[PDB]
Design a protein around this ligand. Structure first.
Ligand SMILES: [Mg+2]
Ligand SMILES: [Mg+2]
Ligand SMILES: [Mg+2]
Ligand SMILES: [Mg+2]
Ligand SMILES: [Mg+2]
Ligand SMILES: [Mg+2]
Ligand SMILES: [Mg+2]
Ligand SMILES: [Mg+2]
Ligand SMILES: [Mg+2]
Ligand SMILES: [Mg+2]
Ligand SMILES: [Mg+2]
Ligand SMILES: [Mg+2]
Ligand SMILES: [Mg+2]
Ligand SMILES: [Mg+2]
Ligand SMILES: [Zn+2]
Lengths: 118, 91, 155, 60, 206, 25
RNA sequence: CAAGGAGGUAAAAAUGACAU
RNA sequence: CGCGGGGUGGAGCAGCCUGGUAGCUCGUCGGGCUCAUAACCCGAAGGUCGUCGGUUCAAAUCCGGCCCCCGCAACCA
RNA sequence: CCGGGCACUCUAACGGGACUGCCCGCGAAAGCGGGAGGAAGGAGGGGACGACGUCUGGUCAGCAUGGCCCUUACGGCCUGGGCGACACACGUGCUACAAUGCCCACUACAAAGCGAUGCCACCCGGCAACGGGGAGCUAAUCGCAAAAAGGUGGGCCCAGUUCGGAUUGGGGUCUGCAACCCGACCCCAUGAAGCCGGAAUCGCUAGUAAUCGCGGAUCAGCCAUGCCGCGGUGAAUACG
């Protein structure tokens, strides 16, 4: 069911199916279905349409999620555009933000190795 | 022209005149050698008898070695009128 | 230089069976030193044997080992920078070890989901002479078969 | 910087976190045991001397 | 080479301590520093006595200090000085019961610290070291010893080349625990550097 | 998941406690 | 029982370093 | 200056004729092996196809103009 | 827990206990093989212990020290920066790629050590880190700690997935004068690479390898996945 921006997860437990949304994770998941009052271990296969409506209405509202909060997150990094701080430059150069070790490692932001040789 | 240092003491003696990285009695010695390696336009100029010049062998191939005093050497790579990796080391 | 001929290690007999063999098999099942999980899996699979066949697992397991026994194996030896492969006989100690090892390995090679059903099935297949371990056994005997040429180098 | 540096180690004023341990027999700042007030080097010396009450070789 | 200090190697069985007091934390550190400063202050103005040991015992403000010496010539009869303010100058940073005793080490030729110290004096007298070693060993061996061994290392007789002079008569088993082996050491200060003298003295045990 | 800060197992490994591993009872 | 006199002989594997 | 052939990674060579894929050995760069160097093993990168135009949907390739390189020819007086 | 008792367990202090002494066989002897003998054996299992010497090994940055040099400075104080930099290369590791596995709940079983300028029971606020209280403990008394792998129950169902946790946004806490450069945790959201590793290369022969957690030093805090220890479960194989 097209809950937020997504619909994908069929026969696979609503507490888990919920996770498949940028903004839900695991904590907001069971938090949303206990506050909406729905059984977590259900089929996800389009069960009681009412439960699905209530779920959708609560989840999609309340807190920001999916493409909207991706925009906000990207905009929070755009904050350090202008004449920003040190943390912005780390987002500029493509290097780790939290001042860690970059002599080795840091491949998750630098990307795969390039090898200079000399 | 000297272009890069590997030894910090050597680096400081030639750049700032900081002598506290080398032996005190080898200050003048090391200086005249470095200036010679700086002025040298080819390895053939670093050939005075008092230098005992020679290229190194094995893994140190591509390097050269003039003699300061006793068992002490200034090693470097000379290429296209310039020396690189100026080191001060045991024989 | 093996001054001592390294005496054969002896085991503790299991529960309910008294085997001088089953525990050796449970040991191969054992990973990270968890004999509890290891023994459980085997006895679990023993319960599984009872279902698909009306046979006592003490024979099903016994015969399976007997069918996955290498009569002769290939041995790489001397002269020519160790160039030859003399087909040697296999000691009862080594047939023992290879049988159980190949069983467990082939068992975890199977596409099944639970460790017990893999063990049970691989044992039933091996008892018949069908298991992937039996493949391994028959394969090792092919190698030993093709090298009868310089077998007379022996030793 | 060694003599004026074993001065500060006992001087200990100005912010409580700027104060640090320091071997007394030597002037070592590293591996200084709080129990003896000595570096691992000095401690070994005196332990072999016998000048360390109760301190004895460990074999087990 | 690499060999463990034959004193520390015993400590428990054979060869007892040299500073025998008990304390828990918050006290050990302070009392050990004071203890060591006593050893440091004594060694200075008491070297002419040549002290084999400096035993120390405590019992809450009691601080007993036993100074072993070959010849206690620097004590000189009660109020003849060399003890009065001398054993009283300790309590200028202590203020506790400065009970200073003096022992008479009978044979100095059987006291390892004294042997090595006599040798180290001779190095600074510009003596021939190899001959000095030989004599000192025999001198120790002459006074009833079961085994002896003296070692001077480095810069022997000046001359640019660190050497190591070696001599040892009788029996010196360092590996054995029931050993009763006395170990001494001394720094010889020379106008050309510093060299160390080891001295091993051995007697029976069981 | 010895390195995940959202498990009783990762909280053990890290040492610290929390929501995913309460200080007993 | 204890050996002398006879004959087939390893491979594919090179180099050397920085004052006496 | 008269004919014929040729310019393609750092080196030497294919691929052109039957337009749409540029491939080979060496070298270079990374990693192994060894105390170390060579040899050896694993793994990479690297080419405006001489140049200026033309044809074509598309040019290393087909057509012209120059520019070098190599080879033949230059005889009868 | 009390009365009372201390024979069991434990605590730590000295002792007893095998020396192939006893039997068979081999041998000239040393010794070897085998057997009842007992908890134990033919150095029982581990430590501490490292010959003469070798490497012009290491170490003047722990310390001592010869010689050279520096002295309105090569010394001294301070604030700030830096040792944490990153196109890359190597070592030692930690965490994984999952179902003999992961998550949640319940429920057991250790040793060795550390603490009243601290360890902090039990309550109270808090999703939690943690904060307020506040008892006991100069500690085989009180506290750090519930050991964890295990067991029971339940849920995922093999798909980069409830595997995996990197990276990044946001919100907090604690130490600290202060954590931007550079601290550790906590909570929400992101959820990357990895589906088991080329040429090569390492460790271990019995409580061992493998796997699991615990303690301590340094320490205001901590970049510790390190080092030094503790015990839990516990293989495989050795022809040669
Ligand atoms: Mg950094
Ligand atoms: Mg310190
Ligand atoms: Mg050659
Ligand atoms: Mg290469
Ligand atoms: Mg090579
Ligand atoms: Mg004519
Ligand atoms: Mg003609
Ligand atoms: Mg011994
Ligand atoms: Mg040297
Ligand atoms: Mg010094
Ligand atoms: Mg560093
Ligand atoms: Mg992928
Ligand atoms: Mg998979
Ligand atoms: Mg071994
Ligand atoms: Zn010190």
């Amino acid at each position: 069911a097209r809950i937020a921006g997504v619909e994908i997860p069929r026969n696979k437990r609503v507490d888990v199916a919920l996770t498949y949304i940028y903004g839900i994770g695991k904590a907001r998941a069971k938090e949303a279905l206990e506050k909406t009052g729905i059984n977590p271990a259900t089929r996800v296969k389009d069960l009681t349409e009412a439960e699905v409506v209530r779920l959708r209405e609560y989840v999609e509202n309340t807190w920001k999620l999916e493409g909207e909060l991706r925009a906000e997150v990207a905009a929070n990094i755009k904050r350090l555009m202008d004449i920003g701080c040190y943390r912005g430059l780390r987002h500029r150069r493509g290097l780790p933000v939290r001042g860690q070790r970059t002599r080795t490692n840091a491949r998750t932001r630098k990307g795969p190795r390039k090898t200079v040789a000399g | 022209g000297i272009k890069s240092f590997k030894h910090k003491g050597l680096k400081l003696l030639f750049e700032k005149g900081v002598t506290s990285g080398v032996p005190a009695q080898d200050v003048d010695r090391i200086n005249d050698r470095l200036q010679a390696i700086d002025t040298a336009t080819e390895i053939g100029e670093l050939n005075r008898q008092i230098y005992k010049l020679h290229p190194l062998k094995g893994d140190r191939e591509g390097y050269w070695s003039i003699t300061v005093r006793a068992n002490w050497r200034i090693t470097f790579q000379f290429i296209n009128g310039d020396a690189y990796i100026l080191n001060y080391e045991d024989y | 230089a093996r001054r001592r001929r390294a005496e054969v290690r002896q085991l503790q007999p299991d529960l309910v069976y008294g085997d001088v063999l089953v525990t050796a098999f449970i040991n191969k099942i054992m990973r990270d030193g968890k004999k509890n999980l290891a023994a459980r899996i085997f006895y679990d699979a023993c319960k599984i044997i009872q279902e698909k066949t009306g046979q006592e697992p003490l024979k099903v397991f016994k015969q399976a080992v007997e069918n996955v026994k290498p009569r002769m194996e290939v041995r790489s030896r001397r002269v020519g920078g160790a160039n030859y492969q003399v087909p040697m006989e296999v000691s009862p100690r080594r047939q023992q070890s290879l049988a159980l090892r190949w069983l467990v390995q082939a068992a975890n090679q199977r596409p099944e989901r639970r460790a017990a059903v893999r063990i049970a099935h691989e044992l039933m297949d091996a008892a018949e002479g069908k298991g992937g371990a039996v493949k391994k056994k028959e394969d090792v005997e092919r190698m030993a078969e093709a090298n009868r040429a310089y077998a007379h180098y022996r030793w | 910087a060694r003599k004026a540096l074993i001065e500060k180690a006992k001087r200990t004023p100005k912010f409580k976190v700027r104060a640090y341990t320091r071997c007394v027999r030597c002037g070592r700042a590293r591996s200084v045991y709080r129990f003896f007030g000595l570096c691992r080097i000095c401690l070994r010396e005196l332990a072999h001397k016998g000048q360390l009450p109760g301190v004895r070789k460990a074999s087990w | 080479g690499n060999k463990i200090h034959p004193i520390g190697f015993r400590l428990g069985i054979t060869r007892d301590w040299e500073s025998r007091w008990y304390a828990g934390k918050k006290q050990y550190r302070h009392l050990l520093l004071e203890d060591q400063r006593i050893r440091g202050l004594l060694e200075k103005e008491l070297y002419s006595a040549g002290l084999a040991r400096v035993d120390i015992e405590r019992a809450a403000d009691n601080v007993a200090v036993t100074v072993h010496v070959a010849k206690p010539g620097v004590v000189i009869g009660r109020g003849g000085e060399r003890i009065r303010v001398l054993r009283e100058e300790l309590a200028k940073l202590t203020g506790k019961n400065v009970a200073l005793n003096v022992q008479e080490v009978q044979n100095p030729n059987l006291s390892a610290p004294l042997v090595a110290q006599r040798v180290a004096e001779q190095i600074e007298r510009r003596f021939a070291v190899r001959r000095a070693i030989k004599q000192a060993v025999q001198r120790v061996m002459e006074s009833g010893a079961k085994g002896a061994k003296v070692i001077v290392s480095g810069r022997i007789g000046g001359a640019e080349q660190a050497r190591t002079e070696w001599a040892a008569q009788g029996r010196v088993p360092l590996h054995t625990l029931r050993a009763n082996i006395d170990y001494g050491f001394a720094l010889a200060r020379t106008t050309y550097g510093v060299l160390g003298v080891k001295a091993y003295i051995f007697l029976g045990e069981v | 998941g010895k390195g995940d800060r959202r498990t009783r197992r990762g909280k053990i490994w890290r040492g610290t406690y929390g929501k995913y591993r309460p200080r007993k009872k």
